[PDB]
Amino acid sequence: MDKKYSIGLAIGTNSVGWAVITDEYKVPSKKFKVLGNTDRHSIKKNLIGALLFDSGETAEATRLKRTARRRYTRRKNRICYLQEIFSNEMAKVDDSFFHRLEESFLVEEDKKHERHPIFGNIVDEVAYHEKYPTIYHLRKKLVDSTDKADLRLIYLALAHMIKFRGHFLIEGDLNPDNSDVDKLFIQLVQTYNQLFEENPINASGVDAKAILSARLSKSRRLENLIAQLPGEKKNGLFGNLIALSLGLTPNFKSNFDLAEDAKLQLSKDTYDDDLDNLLAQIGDQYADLFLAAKNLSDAILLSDILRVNTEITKAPLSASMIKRYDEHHQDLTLLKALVRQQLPEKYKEIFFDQSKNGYAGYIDGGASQEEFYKFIKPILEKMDGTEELLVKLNREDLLRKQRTFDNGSIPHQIHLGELHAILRRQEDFYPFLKDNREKIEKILTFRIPYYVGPLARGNSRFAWMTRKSEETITPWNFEEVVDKGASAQSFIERMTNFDKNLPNEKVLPKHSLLYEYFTVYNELTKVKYVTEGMRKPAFLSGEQKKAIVDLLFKTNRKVTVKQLKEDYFKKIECFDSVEISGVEDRFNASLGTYHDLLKIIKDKDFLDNEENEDILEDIVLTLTLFEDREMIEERLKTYAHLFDDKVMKQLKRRRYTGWGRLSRKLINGIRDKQSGKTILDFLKSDGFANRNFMQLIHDDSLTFKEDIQKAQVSGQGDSLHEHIANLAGSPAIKKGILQTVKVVDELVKVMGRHKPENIVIEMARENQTTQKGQKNSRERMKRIEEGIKELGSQILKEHPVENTQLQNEKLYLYYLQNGRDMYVDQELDINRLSDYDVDAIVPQSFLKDDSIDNKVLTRSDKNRGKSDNVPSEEVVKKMKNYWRQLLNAKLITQRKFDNLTKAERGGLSELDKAGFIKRQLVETRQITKHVAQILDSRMNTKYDENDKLIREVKVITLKSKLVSDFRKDFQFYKVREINNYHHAHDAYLNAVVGTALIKKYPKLESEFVYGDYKVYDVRKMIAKSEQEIGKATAKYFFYSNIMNFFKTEITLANGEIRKRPLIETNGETGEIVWDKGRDFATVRKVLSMPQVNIVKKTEVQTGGFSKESILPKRNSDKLIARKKDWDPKKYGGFDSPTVAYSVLVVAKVEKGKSKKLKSVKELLGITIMERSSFEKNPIDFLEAKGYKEVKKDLIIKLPKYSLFELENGRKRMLASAGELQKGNELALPSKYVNFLYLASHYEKLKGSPEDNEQKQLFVEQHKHYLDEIIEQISEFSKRVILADANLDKVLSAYNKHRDKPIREQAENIIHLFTLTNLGAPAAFKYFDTTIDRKRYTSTKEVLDATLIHQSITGLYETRIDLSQLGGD
RNA sequence: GGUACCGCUCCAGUCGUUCAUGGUUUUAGAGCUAGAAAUAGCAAGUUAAAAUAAGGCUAGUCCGUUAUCAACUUGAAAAAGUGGCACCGAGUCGGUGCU
DNA sequence: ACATTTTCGGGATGGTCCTCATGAACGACTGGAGCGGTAAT
DNA sequence: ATTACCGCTCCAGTCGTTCATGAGGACCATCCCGAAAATGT
Ligand SMILES: [Mg+2]
Ligand SMILES: [Mg+2]
Ligand SMILES: [Mg+2]
């Protein structure tokens, strides 16, 4: 039947709630038949409920997981690449090479050959370190070599240089020399002075290198050079030439008075090509400055990162490492002698003992630099003869470990320098190197471009390449085995802007000539004209529109009325007296691409010919899509009759970026099957007036409605996956939608297959801020301003600040944190906010908060060092109280603060701390825009109507901004921190409001999403806003819109509270929709109503199998070895083995001295690994695990979050492999929840209206609730742990801390509401007492536990029999 | 009562392609004196190489950090489908009656 | 030949330690706010 | 041929209303209970 009920849902990050409301009854109570045992007659449940689920790894964590797979694969392949080059050659000349490489692993008993790494004999193996203290000395030896080295030490050096290959970040050949840098600074100044004799720049003996070497910002380095070298300004020619060498992108358009942009950069191979175009126009005499600037940048890079001069060695990189390496042993020997003489007593302790981060732990362990320096620093300060040792601490030159990240970030080019020498020196000793050098230099330089990508032998979705035959895919003989044109085309067809009306096609480039013609013809259509014979204004015809485009738009970019009157009408149409109307003095439309083409080609033969426009569109499409300049050449070859050799060489520079929103097919590729005309044909000439482009597509007058029916009306298939394959990358939103559509689909089916009137859905994010804009940013300012006014200042009253200044995050971070960082407490300033770096609190991590409160403005992040130990402990000690002052002024959040105290308490959500100090944040919830569309797509899959457009199922998305007044009316305090049954009541209220809104049409409407400010009437009494505080509208007064439409209460009066009468008309037919004598009482009755239908989702664990590390520290049976036959005691197994689910089977395992069979059912964990054969054949699996004698009907599978109910009155849940989870819902009176929230609230706040007056008096008169709460808790311990254990400590603490602040105790009490959750046995700090951490191994009372299998939808429940359990 | 398609700009989030290092595991790594011996002290310390998700298609110079995955019936199998209401009440969800 | 004392072994339990992440060159999307376009009956 | 049925304002710019909402497992130290053997009667 048509309409009987409505449903509502509330979608969170890791939970979905729902509720069903029906006109015929007020009690959401319904029965189901018990499956299996039938322990209860017919179990009833509440229709209001919620589903809990695990959210998984979000955005940047998913990013890191795919990156991590490709990450080591690259390093592994590079090691394998050079191995394939030399291994076979070494095996051919040395028979003993092969066996040593193969027998390098495993125990003696399985080993067939001795290791002998370098020489081939134990006697000679330990002769190496006598001349070579490190790999870097062998590198110097081979680079400066005059003699022959063994192929094992040659491969040893070459293998180091491909494992330690270095980064190919910047394109082009950089100068590997540091011989005479000083000269380059003098020659640039003198060359400028010779070319510009009007105002010479004076060097004045200034050392420019000293300014650049110092750790200053790029802006400050430029400024200091301009201040010390007089003759030119920071924004002048010389300043922009310095900026280029600083690695910036200057634009010399304003410098050479150019009509077009002239940006230069040193990061691209085409820079030399751009200089050829530039010098062709400004002349040869300016070449020296740009070539010297390029070479100086190369010289400065090596000077800064190596700090070693050339010619004393041809290996300055290896030499740079050696100097410090030797100094480490000399400084350590010195300090060791000083400690022996001054501190005999602590001599063993200082060097041997890991616990304080000493020398032994530092060398053999992973001890932090800052902790190591911290320990030895006051020791060196107290000791005599340590002056030089104290300097090395500040320089960071004291005992730095050779292998560390800071010594790893080396570029590919300086590595090629030394490698070219390693190969060249040995060419007259090994002739094989002369032939292999070509292949070696290529793989050392090699990098995969976008248009080639994956070179996979097999067939798969992401295999873009077409392979010719079974040979190779290596760059060697590349064109003979694969075609980069085929991979470039398949790459572009998959990755580019796509047409949203054509699923398999793509849009035109933004430089399309057709795209530009479309806008010009629209403006020409608006034009009316008057002539010498024509009496009244008439519109332009198609031939006249074409004539104006052919004449005026092809001779000047923009057209004006004078041009039409003096040129077009007098020349083409031959009228002296004419007039143009419909437009002003000029048009908005213009041709941009057309005149750009004339300037580059400089001809007219490619213009007016009918076929040439299609030729130019194909060429611009190619120029936008492909950087590959040989692909551009091949496009130009088919049209070579229009393009000579010079223009084709000039075009080889760069891409025409950006696309339009329409493809060509729609515009002039689809013809009307009755008139024969395209949309472009109708645009040029048709009937009176026009409509919007999408309106003309939908228009019933054209035959394009058929194309809509064949494409759009068809829709997606039966499978849900196909409908949720769009919207959101978040696994939290994805799973929320996945379960939401399933719940809605099932609710409509089980409700007698009747259709709901409304489906009301909410979906939100962890919004930490408003977005950029004066409708958003302007309010973010208030969060800063309150902190400023709390601290105190006269600045805000003395001088007003314009609202357009503070619009972005970087300007907000400065005033939120003040002029100081949050890690080392060093100075920040306004002029340095775009010059200093910004960090994330938890980058590339499991969960990420929505925007500005997840980030922090810092000075340098090098202190992070991939560790969880803040090196600025002493800073945290004073800043912790400062950070609490910031939370009190609401400048930083509770989660932001707690991430800096993690070591003391771990995790556990405290997110809505704002609730007692200020909650002000109106959320947009942009995700909700397409949620209804995905559901609507499945729900209204029916076409039994003659284009009636009548929907049967209406899905409505709701904003939570309307719920606030309903929380007040029904006295709801719903912070999830004190209630994990949160979504159940939200979804109910959502169904109430969304249904309420449609029963009588709204009195005050607003525009789509944006709404309020867009359309409103001018009122002077809201104009005082902008002048005083800034723009404001109904977004602030949204509560008054609710009062206008419903008239529920009067908010203009304090004291006695009176509201709208109990029995009032609410429907469009004059009927009563909601009744306060029945409905209102029922809503508040549901709040405390027993047995709400809430469950943790049933599944089994898939994905995330293990972490890429080995833990030989573990040795239990659950450890999965890295290789099957390798001993876990030596070579270990993989970090964190993942169990998909468990199976309950009677054991065949023998116990004790008599070897008795365990004839009782036991838990066997099924791993994601072993599952792969278990599901296919469980018999062989069970026999291998010790469960040999078993029958099919005796095997019971236990999925993830399986439930148990004990006959002794307890409820429990299964984790994964057999571990015990808490379970059991919380039955507790509502009088405790309201008290604790309000008790903290009314600490420093006083009441006034009737309700607030009684709430304050309630907390003040009734302080006995804390004593009743510990009494209720002592009765829940008995249902979980049995013994009270630590509640004697908690009761003692509750009697002890009665003289402590009400708020500060209520701030952490939220951790005791874990009783509502089915897991989370949390440990936390209360006030001065920190509670013990416990976990549940298993249930002793096995035979009393009944196995429960429930549906994910929360409907039917299966109870499994106890007669099969056994026991002997 | 009674609108549709968007231009220009700035900022943010979602992210993708590409490349490198280190943490860490493992093997080779020639010592002296006292004491039955456990055990202790001193001489003495300078390095290199290999490797890092089970498992497997298309059996790889390749892919893999995932969802439905409970009872029940039909289907070789892939795959698909069914889940009662009137009527009263609410401290660990019960009852009258029909189906 | 049987019961008690005796030592060694297993399970339930809690305390402490363990954890593969960094980012710029090059390049694109949705999406919102403020400056706006164009109007009929 | 028209633009809120309702938001009609204060000796002054004020803080505040609601929400997305919680790391556990392995190894080692330890106490209590149970089985087979040696000894006494
Ligand atoms: Mg919500
Ligand atoms: Mg950072
Ligand atoms: Mg909610």
Numbering used by the authors: 1 to 1368
What are the paper's exact sentences on this?
In brief, the sgRNA-guided Cas9 first binds to the target DNA by interacting with its protospacer adjacent motif (PAM); then, the two nuclease domains (HNH and RuvC) catalyze the splitting of the scissile bonds in two DNA strands, respectively. Also, it is known that the HNH domain cuts the 20-mer target sequence complementary to sgRNA, and the RuvC domain cleaves the non-target sequence. Here we use cryo-electron microscopy (cryo-EM) to determine the structure of Streptococcus pyogenes Cas9 (SpCas9) in the DNA cleavage-activating state.
